[PDB]
Amino acid sequence: PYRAGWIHFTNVAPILDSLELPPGVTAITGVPTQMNAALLSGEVDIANVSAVEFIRHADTLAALPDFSVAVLGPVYSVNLFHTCPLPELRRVALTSQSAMSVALLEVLLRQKGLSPVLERAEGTAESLLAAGYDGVLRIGDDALREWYGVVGPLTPERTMTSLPHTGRGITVTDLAQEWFDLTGHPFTFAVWAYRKDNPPPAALLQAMREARRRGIGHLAEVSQRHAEKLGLPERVVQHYLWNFRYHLEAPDRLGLREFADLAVPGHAELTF
Amino acid sequence: PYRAGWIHFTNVAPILDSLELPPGVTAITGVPTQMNAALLSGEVDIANVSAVEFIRHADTLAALPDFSVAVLGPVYSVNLFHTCPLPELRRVALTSQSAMSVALLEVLLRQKGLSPVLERAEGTAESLLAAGYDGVLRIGDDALREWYGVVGPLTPERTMTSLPHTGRGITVTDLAQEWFDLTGHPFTFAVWAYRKDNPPPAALLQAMREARRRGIGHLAEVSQRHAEKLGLPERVVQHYLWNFRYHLEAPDRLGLREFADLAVPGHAELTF
Amino acid sequence: PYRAGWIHFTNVAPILDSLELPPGVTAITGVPTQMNAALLSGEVDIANVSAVEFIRHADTLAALPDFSVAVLGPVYSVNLFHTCPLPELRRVALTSQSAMSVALLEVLLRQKGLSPVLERAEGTAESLLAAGYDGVLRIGDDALREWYGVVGPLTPERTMTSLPHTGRGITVTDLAQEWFDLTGHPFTFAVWAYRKDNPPPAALLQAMREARRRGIGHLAEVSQRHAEKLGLPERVVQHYLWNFRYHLEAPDRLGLREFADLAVPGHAELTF
Amino acid sequence: PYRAGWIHFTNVAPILDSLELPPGVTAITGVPTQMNAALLSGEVDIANVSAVEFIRHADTLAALPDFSVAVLGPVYSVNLFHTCPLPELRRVALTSQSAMSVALLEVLLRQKGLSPVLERAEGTAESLLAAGYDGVLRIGDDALREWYGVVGPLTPERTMTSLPHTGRGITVTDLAQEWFDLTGHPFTFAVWAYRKDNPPPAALLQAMREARRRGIGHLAEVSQRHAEKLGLPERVVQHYLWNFRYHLEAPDRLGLREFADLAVPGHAELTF
């Protein structure tokens, strides 16, 4: 009697990994593209969609008031791999058809007065960069893995935030970090949205806030599982998760709003 | 050999709790005043001290680059309890000797053009607010308990991020929140400083980093332990700790610098 | 054994020059930061500290009731050298680490609604004034020497209290004089402090009272001795010393408290 | 043939004792009454008269700009001896033909709305207090040793500045101190005056300034001579002299004008 469309990225494991769907709610997973359409149509009633998806449809959609995937500073999962200073960037490859990553990239390039050519294309950052592209935008787990594959290994000495930004000629620019450099504020990448008319049941909300307590309470357990199926050290994933802001607090709402005004001028009002 | 002076505050438990000192280093504790002096005089080589303590001695002291006690938004343990609204404040009680809290309060008041009289008084927020005081400034565990006392109790449906700021006619103004409304940046309350002429052994830094991973990796465990000792629900302490920023990243030193300029004009350069 | 941390500033020569330590009491010296720390730490039991140092620790420290380093009117050693009128000051250099002078300068600036930026710099008043700074703050012997360098020389015909306040387009603003024009009271720069839990031995006090008596009784002598190592006329040094108030009397305590209220709101009560 | 009329009591010893009159000047000593009359009539060209004498004749007289007999707080030689609290006071003996003393006493008594009967009588504070007077006003050297005879003796451990105010049922009220409690400012008891049109020769001013330098530089030596004559401990005369402000600086002129306004409303402009 109530569907939900999750997009199980690593960055959301502290919330979804222990969730217990209450009586009356079902869940199904897939890719951003999938869930988005599902939410708008009705194949699903609630989903974790990108900030851009939510902003573009704020007219008919509402977001939970205390759930988000945000950060202040590096995110490590929204990376632009390039082999030449940004200003010299001429051709960029956009992977996994992400409107979120692109929207944020355009805002950043725009402010810098840049305008390289962007093209849909698939492959690893290293592949595409060896196939004519100056830069390659990547998001999600693959973005995290490839980031690590370039910089690091992360040795017992000196923290993860002590890793270089370049490796084997490739330079990894964190878009969330760029946003901080630009606004000094956090950036919100995703939220939980539902149609203003069809709000979720209380049970689901409590069930979710409880799973989150568990996830945040045992990051070492959450990290290990995923680090293993990601082929990454536990500490990398643990730090990666610790770094996320999940309660859509004022600082997150501020960043979300700053971005919404720059990428979707005249967007309906953002409600929660 | 290398002597460390720790002050086991609740907010640094995730870092010190599982700390195993390397061979050749020992640790003692005491009150801040005593611990800061010891560092400055040479009785101790490294200690966790307040931002203001570090700032005022940035010429003989340096701070570990990846360690801090900061927050973005509310901190919950640096509160100004008051009956009338802020602009009406005429008398403010100062619970204890805390250069850090008053320094931040003064910066906030000065900014708003206000200038209520500040007096050292003895007691709790409730009692002092009933003995002729418009506002009472409290810090630490007492501040956290009294905040939860005025607000809350918390329930399965609610989130701590959703608690009201007033109860029984008592408003609780979070100074860290105020600092965000003002600067939009995070605030750094403490750092790990050492005399420049005596850098810490690499072995100690690695031991500290391993201890922080453990604490961050097991928040539920660090939380239960200190919650009972504080008379607070595990979840209150858990979110409390999750809320802290421990790696002194660019956004944290940005806030630190801003505060520095406002509270200690002409301070020596902050070096890490 | 009772230990003392003396810092032989010129203005204390009348007191410490001929001090004969009682048996069972030793004495060391060093830089202010070092001695203040040692005192609060427990390494030193009594020391001649600045008024700010005392005020900021009035809860743990107490001061001898009849010993001070205060002045009514000019002090000649806490000078703000500037080329443009005070209201036009945009950036002031701080020749050294001195919480005292900075604290006094800030109370005076806030009072006049002025807020120039304060930066730590290195060098003489004239060199720094010829490198972008509108004003330079100097304390101690260098301040005295530079003041004489600017407004001097002095002749048999005229008195020291008659020297102009300008020379070569440089105006020397005496901070103690600014304090008088503002409050009409004396200013207390330093006191003799000890930890409340460890009062000094009567034999030391008596030795001190006796030593001051000798210095005050032979000012020409104390002066002739320091006015040589300082490169100054005996008369400049004699008047400089004669001009100090050493008994921490009612008027001096009045000034001290007025300053403590402004510079250190909420400071602990000053006890003697 | 410039004539001088010195009123030579202990408080001016540091200045006159080693005075060396240049060619063309002579000096005649005597009592206030003689000297004042002598200055006014034309016998003497310059004399160190009381502040009241100067103010009341400010129309025809001018005073030296850097010479004075003033203090901040007690003066120890302008005392009101009494056997009952000031309010219950009802019979005060005026011990001399000094206007300086009664002027100050009356200004003070009126400020407290007190109005005991005042009448001229001759004798020591103790004899007159035993001859039907509950109050006796004394000034000068006798005032100093009768104060000591009451509140003394002085012990090596205790300081003069901490000597009691009462003795054998006799309270000594220091009028300079009363002035401080009333204005927070210094009091000027005397200046060096001369008829406006008959200024003193340069050689005399330089002779005076040099003598002052010598006296202030050797207080112990100056104190002994006078202590013996007065039958007082050397340290008493020494603190007494050390306590005097001799340069007629701004703080002293403020106190002078303050007094002038109260005691001689509408007085002529004081000129130097």
Author numbering:
A (entry chain A), B (entry chain B), C (entry chain C), D (entry chain D): 16 to 287
List sentences from the manuscript.
The Pfam protein family DUF178 (ID: PF02621) consists of 61 proteins of unknown function, 59 from bacteria and 2 from archaebacteria. Herein, we report the first crystal structures of DUF178 family members, including Q9RXE3 from Deinococcus radiodurans and Q9L0T8 Streptomyces coelicolor and show that they are remarkably similar to Pfam family DUF191. The structure determination of 10093b and 10093f has revealed the unexpected similarity between DUF178 and DUF191 family of proteins suggesting that the information from three-dimensional structures along with the sequence information will predict the family of proteins of similar functions more reliably. We have predicted the protein to be a solute-binding protein based on structure and binding cavity.
The structure of 10093b was determined to 2.5Å resolution using Selenium-SAD. The final refined model of 10093b contains 8 protomers, 18 sulfate ions, and 653 water molecules. Eight monomers A, B, C, D, E, F, G, and H found in the asymmetric unit form four tightly packed dimers (AB, CD, EF, and GH). A dimer interface analysis performed using PDBSUM demonstrated that each pair buries ~3,000Å2 of solvent accessible surface area (12.3% of the total area), a value higher than would be found typically in interacting surfaces for a protein of this size. There are 6 direct hydrogen bonded interactions between the protein atoms across the dimer interface. Such a tight dimer interface suggests that the 10093b dimer is functional, which is supported by the results of analytical gel filtration (data not shown). In the 10093b dimer, Glu172 from the atypical Val166-Ser177 loop makes one of the six hydrogen bonds present in the dimer interface while three other residues in the same loop contribute to van der Waals interactions. We suggest that the atypical loop found in 10093b may help support dimerization. Further analysis of these surface features together with a multiple sequence alignment performed in ClustalW and edited in BioEdit performed for 10093b reveals the presence of most of the conserved residues, including Asn26, Pro47, Ser92, Ser113, Ser116, Ile154, Gly155, and Asp156. The binding pocket of 10093b superposes well with that of nitrate-binding protein. Based on the comparison of structures and binding sites, we predict that this protein could be a solute binding protein, though we cannot at this stage identify the nature of the ion.
